[PDB]
Each structure stands twice: as C-alpha cells, then as structure tokens.
Paper text:
The structure of the CHAO·FAD·cyclohexanone ternary complex was solved by molecular replacement using the structure of the holoenzyme monomer as a search model. As with the holoenzyme, the ternary complex crystallized with four molecules per asymmetric unit. An examination of an omit map in the area of the substrate binding pocket for CHAO crystallized in the presence of excess cyclohexanone shows an appropriately-shaped positive electron density feature large enough to accommodate a cyclohexanone molecule. Modeling of cyclohexanone into this electron density results in the plane of the cyclohexanone ring being oriented perpendicular to the flavin ring, with the oxygen atom rotated towards the FAD cofactor at a distance of 3.7 Å from the flavin N5 atom. In this position, the cyclohexanone molecule is sandwiched between the aromatic side chains of Y321, F368 and Y459. These residues, along with the cofactor, form an “aromatic cage” similar to that observed in other MAO structures. The RAMD simulations performed using the structure of CHAO with cyclohexanone bound in the substrate-binding pocket identified one route of egress as predominant.
An examination of the three dimensional atomic structure of CHAO reveals that the overall fold is substantially similar to that of the human MAO B monomer, with a RMSD of 1.1 Å for the coordinates of the α-carbon atoms.
Author numbering: 30 to 478
Amino acid sequence: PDVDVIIIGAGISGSAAAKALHDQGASVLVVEANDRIGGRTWTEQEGAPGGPIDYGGMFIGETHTHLIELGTSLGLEMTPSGKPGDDTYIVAGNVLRAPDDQLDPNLPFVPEFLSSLKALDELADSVGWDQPWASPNAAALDSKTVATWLAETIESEEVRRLHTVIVNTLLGADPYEVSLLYWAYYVSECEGIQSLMGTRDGAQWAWWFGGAAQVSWRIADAIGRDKFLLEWPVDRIEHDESGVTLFSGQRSLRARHIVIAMSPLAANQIRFEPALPTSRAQLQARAPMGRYYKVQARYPSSFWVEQGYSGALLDTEDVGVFLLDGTKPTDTLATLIGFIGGSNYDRWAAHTPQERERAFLDLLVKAFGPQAADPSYFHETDWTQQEWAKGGPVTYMPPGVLANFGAALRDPVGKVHFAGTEASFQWSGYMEGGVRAGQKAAAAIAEEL
Ligand SMILES: Cc1cc2nc3c(=O)[nH]c(=O)nc-3n(C[C@H](O)[C@H](O)[C@H](O)COP(=O)(O)OP(=O)(O)OC[C@H]3O[C@@H](n4cnc5c(N)ncnc54)[C@H](O)[C@@H]3O)c2cc1C
C-alpha cells in the first residue's frame, strides 16, 4: 500500500479531506482527473482584466463556519459580498425595485408569494436535513415533482414563475424534473430559502480576495504540492478487506483507505470491483448535475450601485436569471455576475453565443441603464459542458431516489468512504458542505487507524 489514504478528487472537499488526514499524521495522496487543483471552484487570478475571476463557486455564507475557519487558517482574507442599494425584480417583463428585498405590498402577486415562501419553509421542516428519506411524508413528497407541487398549491401565475427561477437557479434544474422531497430537503439543509436567497447575507455574504480556488491550492502547498497528482483520472477501483487499488489506465496506486470526493454522478463514471451495493449504485446513476451558465460582465464603474441599486436582481422571463454584484474593493473593474440554469440554460444554449450575450446585456440595460450596453469584458462559462464537473452548480434528484437510497450519500462501502459536498449533512451543494464532508470523511478514516 503506497500510502494510508488516497483521496480521489482535488476539489475543496477532497482537499479539505487531505489536509485533515495529513495534519493527523496519515500518509496521503490526492489523485486528480484533470490539470487544475480547483474544484467547481475555478479561479484565474491574472487571467482576465479588472481582477481575479471565479468561474465556479465564490460566495461564502455567513454561517459557513468550516469554510471560514479553513480559509483563515490558510491565511486567506475575506471581503463582504454585499452592496448598498435596492434589489431588483423583473417580473412579467416589468422592472420592480425592492428596498431591502421588500417589494411593494400592493403588488398583486406579493402576498401569495410570501405565503407560498412560508409554505416552502414549512415543508422543508417536515422532512429534515439528517434523514429526509425517513420523514413521514417522504413517500408522498418524493413521488411528485416540484412542478406539480407549484401547480397544485399556487394561484398566481407570477408566484409560480418566481418559484421556478428560484429552483432553476439554486439547482441547475427546473421544477419539472426535480423531486419535491428533494427540494424540501435542500431548503431544509441550507437553512431555508431566506438564507438560500440572501443578497447581502445568508449564503451570499462574503468572498476570498484572490479567488475561491485558493483554499485548495493553499492546502496543496501546505500539504506538499508533490502529493497532488494531476491528470490522474481514476477509472477502476478494486477494493477488498485489506485496502484499495486505484487504476488510471495502466498506472495504479494502493492505499489502506480512499475517499472519493466528487459528485455521485462523477463517481458513477468509475468501475468498482466488486460492484457497489445496489442503493449506492442506484443513487449514483440517478442523481444528475444541473444545466448552468455563469455569465460575467465588467465595466469601468459600478453604475448600478452609483444609481442606488445593489446590482442584485431576479428575472422571471426576460432571460431567467439571478444577477449579483461581484465587485471586490481590490478589483479595478466593476463586475456584475449572472446565473442561468435549468430550462433557462436549455433556452439560451439553443441560441448563438452572440445572441446570448446580446440578450444578457439587454437585460442588464433594462435594469441598470445604457451604461450596461457596452462592457469592458464579458465571459460565459457553460458548466453543463465542463468535462469533469459534467454540469449545473449542484446535484439534484428526480422523484423516486432520495427517499429510497438517500443514505447511500453518506454510508461508506467497506474501505471506500464518501466526501464531496453531496455527502455533507448540511450545506450540501456548497463549498461549506464540501469542506465538512471532507473533514468528516477524514475523521472516520482517522478513527479506522
Ligand atoms: C457556476 C457555479 C457557481 C457556484 N457558486 C457557489 C457559491 O457561490 N458558493 C458555494 O458554496 N458553492 C457554489 N457552487 C458549488 C461549489 O462550487 C461546490 O459545491 C463545491 O465546489 C463542490 O466541491 P467538491 O469538492 O465536493 O466537488 P468538485 O468541486 O466537483 O471536485 C471534484 C473533483 O474530482 C475530480 N474528479 C472527477 N472525476 C474524477 C476521476 N474519475 N478521477 C479523479 N478525479 C476525478 C474533479 O476534476 C474535481 O477536481 C457553485 C457551482 C457552480 C458550478
């Protein structure tokens, strides 16, 4: 056995796992499929103009305790993501402003929207974060889509449309392909849509100067860059009572334990001898990744903030996106970032690169004025077609799975253990979760030695 533990996957999670295992004294190796240490945290510090740019995850939540601790211990510094000003909703094509995310109460759709929002949170409490599958209403919830739930519950077409962008954007899927139990679970495990949907707090409250991929790179540096083997895609995993043997084509390694720290979908692209037990097998084969676009437009000044707008925006139909200010104090170019997912992604991916850009810029203009009409820099990053991430921002599940194999997300199969954000108890789908899943996997393994 070449080493104690081999961590497959060099994301925040795999990396956090290796730091932990390493600090505890175990011999460790991190085997990574492509040629970069970031996870779905992808950073180019000198790449683009204006400042460092993140193509993946970048927001640190106010309660993302493990991420903050780890980042800090690595010497990284945080800066507030929030911006002062009114938030913006583009509903039915009309521009609405909301002082402290407080829409005019007289707007016809507002009260039922609030009401439905409270409904969602209540449903999120009926099923929990720890054992959604064991919840009393698990069977009924996991048997229908979020789409059918919106149709049966809500009156206002506009409320329905708000919920849909929200789901299309937090997951990279549309309510028409997501299990209701699964979403109730998600809202529950990320502390409610209120935090899930924050604009200046909750999940979206801070950034790392320098880029999110740093926590990873820094770990590698701290742990011994030589320990991270890039371009080493694991394709077969032979595991017995003694340990595990990884194969990358002809090459191979041997360890006492392994932690596969990637999405279920991603892990499902690896052969396991012996075959994985059937619940984990189903879980991996049936838990897809979202369909997502991360657009970025930089300008010489924060004209949106300068005009009293926070840059935070929600649009139900022009494009189908959540906008957010992404300007660091340090940057030399103001930047607005937008996220398009699910069916909204489907929509645009069908258009041409330029059509997309035009449409996006048009929107920015409708919301913030003609200055948006012409950016200093524009970038789009299609996650649904990234080779190793294979999609959206997070994992999602169709009706029929979470309630039948959910536990497979966490339970180890012999000597192989599972990390990756999807295995976190809470904040699964976020870097925080990634960090937590990694550390818990590490501890489990530590204890086995
Ligand atoms: C556009 C976008 C925006 C996001 N924004 C945020 C945000 O603001 N805040 C937040 O908290 N989260 C955000 N996220 C999610 C966050 O990035 C992820 O939750 C987190 O990075 C997942 O980490 P991970 O370590 O579990 O997995 P990953 O980051 O997916 O890393 C898994 C690693 O495994 C490697 N791998 C895959 N297959 C193999 C194989 N066969 N052999 C070897 N290695 C393999 C991969 O290449 C990769 O490096 C966002 C995601 C996207 C796509």
